[PDB]
Amino acid sequence: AQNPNCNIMIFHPTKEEFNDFDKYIAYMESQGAHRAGLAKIIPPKEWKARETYDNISEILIATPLQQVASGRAGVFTQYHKKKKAMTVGEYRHLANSKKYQTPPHQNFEDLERKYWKNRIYNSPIYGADISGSLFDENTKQWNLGHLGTIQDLLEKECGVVIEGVNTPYLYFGMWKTTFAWHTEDMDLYSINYLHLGEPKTWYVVPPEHGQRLERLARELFPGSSRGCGAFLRHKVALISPTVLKENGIPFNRITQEAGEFMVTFPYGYHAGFNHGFNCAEAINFATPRWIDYGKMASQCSCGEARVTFSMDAFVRILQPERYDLWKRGQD
Ligand SMILES: O=C(O)CNC(=O)C(=O)O
Ligand SMILES: [Mg+2]
Ligand code: NI
Ligand SMILES: [Zn+2]
């Protein structure tokens, strides 16, 4: 069995190996990468996502989200307070302001310590979930706006044609902006490219141990657990590495820098934070190996998790028994 300790693997494809996306994902899996829940891919030195980032300031963040925390330093929830629209240039200035900028620090480890110690006492503003792409149309390799669609994968594997589309999303971050513990919708893969700016630290639980994290979360968030049998689909709960270690939950951590891809694997719980002003692009995708995960994925039917149009068909086809109840949640 490859990678039995479920370590995060880092890959360095050549330009020739970067041509065929599906084939490279399958290669990484042949070496055990999926067992970690997360892999890093460093693109060949010849590759570029686009020529420059010099002309992005006029992108609109229509609904910036202020991430307000409740709880204790290592065990907290966050809610998102909607703010007035602003451009990327306005948001960058805000991120660099004395109120929001990254503090002086020695290295990534010192910054991580400061994040866990102090996150809850601040409310950073995240430009998350913005439909669009920063890949140049002429970039042919690993262009997240040109991937094979999940609808087409389901059709190829299962023979059923379904409605829906699959497009990327931009994330503009600042110091302390946070992504809560989650897996993807329908336990899909995700891929994330850090286009520019400061790093993003990730934490991940191996898929084979995801239920250990769920059981801890039910203990630590007992009212939420009573409210919903899949409340981590709400994407609001944070648990620190110190707390995970105290409770024996297996996990790993890694920092992504500008110019690097991360891939999350089906049912790989992940969480993390941004170090300062940055811009990432991400999309979900599927492979043949995902189908069995999609069939078994938990679902939120309490009404909180509220998701895309395209998830309807996945539930309807892969989880027909759950369909009725899940759709009541969506309506
Ligand atoms: O970058 C973020 O805020 C969150 N990204 C992801 O969870 C992902 O790419 O799967
Ligand atoms: Mg612009
Ligand atoms: Ni994710
Ligand atoms: Zn719910």
UniProtKB/Swiss-Prot annotation:
Keyword line: ADP-ribosylation, Chromatin regulator, Dioxygenase, Iron, Metal-binding, Nucleus, Oxidoreductase, Transcription, Transcription regulation, Ubl conjugation, Zinc
Keyword Transcription recorded: yes
Chain positions with PolyADP-ribosyl glutamic acid modification: E16, E17
Reactions performed catalytically: N(6),N(6),N(6)-trimethyl-L-lysyl(9)-[histone H3] + 2 2-oxoglutarate + 2 O2 = N(6)-methyl-L-lysyl(9)-[histone H3] + 2 formaldehyde + 2 succinate + 2 CO2
Subcellular location: Nucleus
Cellular-component GO terms for this entry: blood microparticle; chromatin; nucleoplasm; nucleus; pericentric heterochromatin; site of double-strand break
EC number assigned by the record: 1.14.11.66
Cofactor note as given: Binds 1 Fe(2+) ion per subunit.
Taxonomic superkingdom: Eukaryota
GO BP term (any one): regulation of gene expression
Residues noted as binding Fe cation in the record, renumbered to the chain: H182, E184, H270
PTM note: Ubiquitinated via 'Lys-63'-linked ubiquitin chains. Deubiquitinated by USP14 with the help of TRIM14 leading to stabilization.
Residue ranges of domain JmjN in the record: 8-50
Molecular function as annotated in GO: chromatin DNA binding; damaged DNA binding; histone demethylase activity; histone H3K9 demethylase activity; histone H3K9me2/H3K9me3 demethylase activity; metal ion binding
Main localization of the protein described in the UniProt heading: nucleus
Residues the entry annotates as binding 2-oxoglutarate: Y126, N192, K200, K235
The keyword Magnesium is annotated on this UniProt entry: no
Cofactor(s) the protein needs: Fe(2+)
Stated role: Histone demethylase that specifically demethylates 'Lys-9' of histone H3, thereby playing a central role in histone code. Does not demethylate histone H3 'Lys-4', H3 'Lys-27', H3 'Lys-36' nor H4 'Lys-20'. Demethylates both di- and trimethylated H3 'Lys-9' residue, while it has no activity on monomethylated residues. Demethylation of Lys residue generates formaldehyde and succinate.
Protein name: Lysine-specific demethylase 4D
Organism annotation: Homo sapiens (Human)
Gene name for this UniProt entry: KDM4D
